[PDB]
Specification:
The structure is cut from a larger assembly and holds 9 protein chains of 8 kinds.
Chain D lengths: L4 E3 L5 E5 L8 E6 L4 E7 L6 E6 L6 E5 L3 E5 L6 E6 L6 E7 L12 E6 L4 E5 L16 E3 L8 E4 L5 E5 L7 E5 L4 E2 L13 E6 L5 E6 L4 E5 L3
Antiparallel strand pairs in D: 1-2, 2-3, 3-4, 5-6, 6-7, 7-8, 9-10, 10-11, 11-12, 13-14, 14-15, 15-16, 17-18, 18-19
Chain E lengths: L3 H28 L5 H5 L3 H8 L1
Helix pairs in contact in E: 1-3
Chain G lengths: L28 H11 L1 H4 L46 H6 L3 H15 L5 H11 L1
The chains are: A mainly alpha, B mainly beta, C mainly alpha, D mainly beta, E mainly alpha, G mainly alpha, H alpha+beta, I mainly alpha.
Chain lengths: 42, 59, 30, 226, 53, 159, 131, 121, 445
């Protein structure tokens, strides 16, 4: 059985603050970064 | 000289080898130390309690 | 504290030089 | 003395720490039904045995001594299964041991939590001790450094979901920790939660009620609801 | 690897910057008798020496 | 001709600095690294310095004047003309000077005492410098992206 | 060609526009000693050279700049201070000059004239009465 | 490896960390590699304890050179986290340096402890 | 001072200048030129420079040619916006909002900045369309052009949602993403305004990846901070906070999940749904609503991100089975099991695969048997999930009243499976205590 994923918001703020809105990686790559951050795999 | 104890009051009273590289020494401060001869290191310090039959707490 | 540390470094160097000069001025041998 | 003891969860045995420190502590193990000595488990330390805990199946026991050495000692073979070290503990103070679905040959308890005299409480997943060989230097699942004074009480939930650990020497120094996530709950206790100087804690049998008793002599009860 | 070349090369670099600045100012005053407005047009002394060339 | 020789001397200084100390060259660059080696005398003589010393190498006149007259000491020395302390502005300049001097002390100790199997690529010989520069640029952009103070937004009435 | 501007919107003058930008006085303690010396330069040359009595309430001007005489090309054997006489301030030059004993002599004459009858005199009179 | 005056005996390691904790309460302790280097260079340092669990071990290897030049005893403990929460820090401290004064029970403990370190060497 | 308050509201609501110094200041506010030059500029000079800029923009992109006729016209040199009626002003506002949505993609370029300078210096867009102009410059909040727009903006003309910008107008520095995100978590109006701007652009198909990445990042971090605020521990307050979060979010995600033509905003809405399903402990019916709309919404371009977000949504549910249409469109998915192995290398697809097998078994259709066989031999389920799935398959075989031929073929293949799945299936046979050979010879005879 699983629970709710706990993630400190500074990591997600680093994910999005790595670059400006223009000249950011494409949204598939940023989605895989956010999903691997919120993935509950040990 | 392989090693020496930190406490100067530790006297080595008996010695016997478990294998080719592991030396088991008894001491006067209630310990049985198990040194390793090649690097001179210490595997484990077995200990024994007080003697509760008389005085002289160090076995 | 910073001022006392600099003055202590200077005074320790003076003590080392003066003790070296005092030893150089003035059952040992078997 | 007979002050510190632990009865096994099966109820058959009871272990008493023998008051003989001398660089290593022993504890005499007594059959409960006949009140007779049946075994003795001796560990090497500096001041003896900080705490210990029976395994959940009831056979062995894990003895955490002072100066960091923790020892799993079985009852079947009646000698030491293994010795490992808490991470950087300059001296242990308390230990607790809980959960389910752990390693089958180490009692079947999942989590061990060891609180030192500095204030730091390490929580280890006991499936990470098995390398029967025990790793001599396991790494913690989580190191809790929230409390600043020495950890005096530690208690797992009987279903193995909560972990309450507290220090006596500060007013309202008690924290409550989820498992397996190992996250300190931030909404409780608050600034105005009347804990006191926490001396003993106890979870209920269905783990619905936390009881906290302080140094003044007042028990207070909290329903746990998820 | 030895660093005596590092300390000698950076002392040489500082002295070369000083001597190059003074020789460039000297060729500015030395060609300003024949063409003075070039020193106001070109403030970069390397390009000034290149134009004098 | 003097300018052409000075340019090739700068290129030689860069190549010799990437040969000697790849970590520090990956941190601050060859010219500021050569200035630090010059003031300390040698690489193993720079490596015995604390990070607070490497912060104010070169600003020693103002440092000892301030220490002897109980003034406020200088915030940085040779480190000011590096790249990574020049992007900051305000007090974040002094904060980045502290952090950069500490990472320079670590990188100089690594480049002066660590051994390598001699079939070691430069990309793994400058590993501490690469990691320290990436972490330090992240800390710089956090310090620069610290937001300003909130205020009460007032209407035309003053309400 | 034509770029977005940089918006740069966020008392007494710093430099005088009519006097080729003399900077405002950084009123250091050494410059304050120098300005006190300049208002007391009649006393420094002890009567050998008197000066124009300019006595404002504030001796520190608003705009100053501490400079050094370089060189007259016509005179360079005796109109040139040597290396052991080119000092940092003006007060250091006054102290390195002579007649410091003359200042001390005049100061001790003033001190005797001002201790002439004040309170040690009355302590001595009271002791001579009590004896 | 390069940590040759290693303190491997756990009794001696416990004695070293207990004296570190007592000096930390006496405020007679310098924590960190830079502060340790400053105390050893200034010569106020009586004993210096490095840690061998440093992941680049070469960032504390300069302190053996200054201790060989200034004749102070240095020793290596196993765990930097143990050294850190022995000082009372809640961080990992890789080098610590404990100083001396005029008259203390702590100074007597320092003299006995550097005698034990000289027994290791 | 009630009269001074009424007159202050009148003076703030007034729009046209009425004295010469006010006209000179309002004409002085510009993007490109400094104020000392921009005071003394007629509307022929500005139109010449900014029409060169619009000629460059109209040669770059094709769709500026209606604005060539209506906004950048030689007659539009002369039109005063404050002298036309309310419907003329509203139609001009619609034309300006359409141009700003169109020009938002190229706004780092000096032609587009010259065109925006024409709108600002003729139609006074910084005073009359402050919302759309500030929203279209918000994805570029790290640039000096945003610093200049922030400099020339009037203070009381900004909407209430963008009043975090006041210290960045008092000290001319670009605001950070931390400030924008923190005001988005605190105010629902700013998040609704950003999402409304980008959805109103994306319905007109004038999207660009900078805007899509901007909105996706700020709604992700805003939903993150909003969940961390909404969490309370009290049951009724966390129920009401989950309801308020869904009522503030639901229209935006319900449109951006099924916007088929814009796969970038679809993937960004998938990112927001993944954060909302992982971190916020929601209910099973809400998660089936999200899964059903994602299943209705995907394309081929967002199929693998949709499957990642579907694994997270199905993993964080308390129920065991999927609600129908989810399993129907995952039947329609081309390479299900190989894609799920590529996801299960990083994401733990077990509960999705278990619910998929149960929802396929609950169908009496017999065109799902290759998918059931592949999902069973996949090594994706656990031993208990595989055992209860095979038990439900044999119970469906007992419940059926051809069909049984394909069922028995699948059952004999699953019994003669090779590895640990076959071990667990034969163990499931041994614990349901029913013989293989009965149905074996029944289907073989």
């Amino acid at each position: 059985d699983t629970h709710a994923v706990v993630v400190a918001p500074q990591r997600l703020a680093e994910i999005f603050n790595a670059a400006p809105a223009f000249a950011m990686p494409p949204i598939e790559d940023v989605f895989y970064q956010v999903a691997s951050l919120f993935s509950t795999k040990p | 000289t392989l090693t020496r104890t930190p406490s100067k009051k530790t006297k080595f009273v008996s010695i016997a080898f478990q294998s080719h590289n592991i030396v088991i020494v008894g001491c006067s401060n209630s310990t049985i130390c198990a040194y390793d001869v090649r690097t001179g290191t210490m595997l484990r310090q077995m200990t024994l309690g007080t003697d509760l039959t008389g005085g002289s707490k160090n076995i | 504290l910073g001022y006392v540390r600099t003055m202590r470094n200077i005074a320790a160097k003076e003590l080392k030089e003066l003790e070296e000069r005092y030893v150089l001025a003035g059952p040992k041998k078997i | 003395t007979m002050e510190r003891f632990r009865v096994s969860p099966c109820g058959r045995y009871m272990a008493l720490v023998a008051s003989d420190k001398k660089g290593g502590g022993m504890l005499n193990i007594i059959n409960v039904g006949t009140m007779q000595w049946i075994a003795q488990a001796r560990i090497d330390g500096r001041h003896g045995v900080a705490d210990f805990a029976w395994w959940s199946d009831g056979n062995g026991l894990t003895i955490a001594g002072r100066d960091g050495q923790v020892t799993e000692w079985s009852m079947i073979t009646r000698r030491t299964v293994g010795i490992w070290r808490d991470e950087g503990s300059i001296g242990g103070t308390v230990m607790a041991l809980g959960g389910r679905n752990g390693p089958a040959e180490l009692g079947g308890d999942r989590w061990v939590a060891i609180g030192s005299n500095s204030g730091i409480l390490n929580v280890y997943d006991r499936n990470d001790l098995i390398e029967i060989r025990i790793k001599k230097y396991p790494t913690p699942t989580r190191v809790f450094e929230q409390l600043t004074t020495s950890i005096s009480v530690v208690a797992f939930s009987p279903d193995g979901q909560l972990l309450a650990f507290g220090s006596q020497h500060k007013k309202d120094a008690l924290r409550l920790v989820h498992l397996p996530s190992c996250t300190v709950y931030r909404n409780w206790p608050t600034e105005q939660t009347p804990l006191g100087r926490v001396t003993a804690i106890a979870f209920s049998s269905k783990s619905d009620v936390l009881a906290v008793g302080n140094d003044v002599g007042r028990v207070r009860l909290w329903e746990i609801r998820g | 690897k030895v660093d005596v070349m590092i300390v000698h090369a950076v002392a040489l670099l500082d002295e070369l910057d000083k001597e190059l600045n003074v020789m460039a100012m000297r060729v500015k005053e030395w060609y300003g008798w024949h063409f003075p407005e070039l020193g106001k047009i070109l403030p970069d002394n390397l390009s000034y020496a290149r134009v004098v060339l | 001709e003097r300018s052409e020789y000075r340019r090739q001397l700068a290129e030689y200084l860069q190549n010799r600095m990437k040969a000697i100390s790849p970590n520090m060259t990956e941190l601050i660059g060859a010219l500021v690294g050569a200035r630090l080696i010059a003031h300390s005398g040698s690489l193993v003589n720079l490596a015995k310095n604390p990070g607070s010393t490497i912060q104010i190498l070169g600003a020693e006149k103002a440092l000892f004047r301030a220490l002897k007259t109980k003034h406020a000491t200088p915030k940085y020395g040779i480190i000011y003309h590096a790249s990574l302390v020049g992007q900051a502005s305000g007090p974040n300049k002094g904060k980045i000077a502290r952090q950069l001097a500490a990472k320079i002390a670590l990188s100089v100790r690594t480049d002066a005492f660590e051994d390598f199997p001699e079939n070691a690529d430069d990309e793994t010989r400058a590993a501490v410098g690469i990691q320290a520069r990436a972490k330090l640029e992240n800390n710089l952009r956090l310090l620069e992206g610290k937001p300003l103070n909130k205020g009460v937004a007032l209407g035309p009435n003053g309400i | 060609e034509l770029s977005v501007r940089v918006p740069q919107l966020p008392g007494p003058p710093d430099t005088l526009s009519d006097w080729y930008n003399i900077p405002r006085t950084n009123l250091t303690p050494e410059l304050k000693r120098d300005l006190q010396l300049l208002r007391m330069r009649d006393v420094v040359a002890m009567g050998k050279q008197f000066f124009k009595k300019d006595n404002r309430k504030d001796f520190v001007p608003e705009y100053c700049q501490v400079g050094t005489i370089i060189a007259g090309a016509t005179d360079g054997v005796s109109g040139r201070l040597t290396r052991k006489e080119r000092k940092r301030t003006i007060v250091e030059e006054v102290l390195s000059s002579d007649s410091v004993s003359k200042y001390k002599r005049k100061y001790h004459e003033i001190q005797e004239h001002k201790k002439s009858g004040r309170k040690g005199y009355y302590k001595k009179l009271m002791a001579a009465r009590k004896r | 490896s390069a940590a040759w005056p290693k303190a491997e005996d756990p009794a001696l390691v416990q004695e070293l960390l207990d004296c570190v904790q007592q000096a930390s309460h006496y405020r007679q302790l310098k924590k960190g590699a830079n502060e340790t280097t400053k105390s050893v260079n200034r010569g106020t340092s009586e004993l210096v304890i490095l840690a061998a669990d440093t992941q680049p071990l070469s960032i504390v290897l300069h302190i053996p050179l200054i201790c060989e030049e200034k004749n102070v005893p240095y020793v290596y403990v196993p765990s930097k986290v143990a050294l850190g929460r022995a000082c009372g820090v809640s961080r990992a401290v890789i080098a610590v340096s404990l100083t001396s004064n005029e008259a203390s029970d702590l100074n007597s403990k320092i003299r006995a402890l550097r005698d034990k370190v000289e027994r290791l060497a | 001072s009630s009269l001074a308050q009424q007159l202050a509201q009148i003076a703030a609501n007034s729009r046209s200048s009425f004295n010469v110094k006010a006209l000179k200041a309002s004409h002085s506010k510009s993007l490109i030129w400094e104020p000392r030059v921009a005071v003394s500029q007629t509307f022929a000079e500005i139109y010449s420079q900014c029409y060169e800029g619009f000629k460059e923009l109209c040669h770059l992109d094709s769709r500026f040619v209606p604005f060539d006729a209506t906004l950048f016209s030689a007659q539009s040199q002369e039109v005063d916006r404050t002298q036309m009626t309310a419907e003329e002003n509203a139609a001009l506002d619609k034309r300006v909002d359409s141009f700003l949505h169109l020009v938002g993609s190229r706004l780092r370029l000096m032609p587009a900045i010259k065109a925006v300078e024409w709108l600002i210096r003729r139609f006074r867009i910084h005073e009359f369309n402050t919302g759309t102009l500030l929203a279209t410059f918000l994805p570029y909040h790290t640039i000096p052009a945003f610093v200049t727009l922030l400099s020339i903006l009037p203070v009381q003309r900004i909407p209430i949602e963008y009043r975090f910008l006041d210290p960045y107008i008092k000290s001319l520095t670009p605001p950070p993403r931390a400030a924008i995100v923190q005001q988005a978590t605190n105010r629902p109006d700013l998040l609704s305004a950003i999402s409304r701007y980008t959805l109103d652009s994306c319905r007109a198909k004038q999207e660009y990846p900078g805007l899509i990445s901007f909105w996706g990042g700020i709604m992700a971090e805003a939903v993150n901070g909003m969940i961390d605020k909404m969490r309370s521990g009290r049951r009724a307050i966390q129920l009401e906070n989950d309801h308020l979060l869904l009522q503030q979010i639901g229209p935006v995600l319900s449109e951006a999940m099924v916007m088929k033509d814009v796969p970038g905003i679809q993937i960004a809405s998938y990112m927001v749904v993944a954060i909302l399903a992982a971190k916020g402990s929601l209910n099973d019916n809400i998660l089936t609503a999200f899964m059903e709309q994602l299943v209705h919404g995907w394309t081929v371009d967002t199929l693998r991100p949709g499957l990642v977000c579907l694994t997270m949504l199905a993993q964080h549910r308390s129920a065991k089975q999927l609600s129908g249409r989810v399993a129907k469109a995952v039947i329609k998915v081309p390479d299900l099991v190989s894609s799920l192995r590529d996801i299960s290398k990083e994401h733990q697809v077990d509960k999705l695969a278990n619910g998929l097998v149960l929802a396929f078994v609950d169908r009496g259709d017999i065109r799902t048997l290759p998918v059931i066989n592949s999902l069973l031999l996949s090594e994706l389920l656990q031993e208990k999930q595989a055992k209860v799935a095979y038990k439900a398959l044999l119970l469906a075989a007992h419940k059926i009243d051809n069909i049984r031929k394909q069922v028995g073929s699948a059952l004999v293949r699953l019994s003669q499976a090779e590895g640990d799945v076959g071990d667990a299936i034969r163990t499931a046979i041994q614990e349901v205590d029913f013989n293989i050979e009965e149905l074996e010879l029944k289907l073989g005879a």
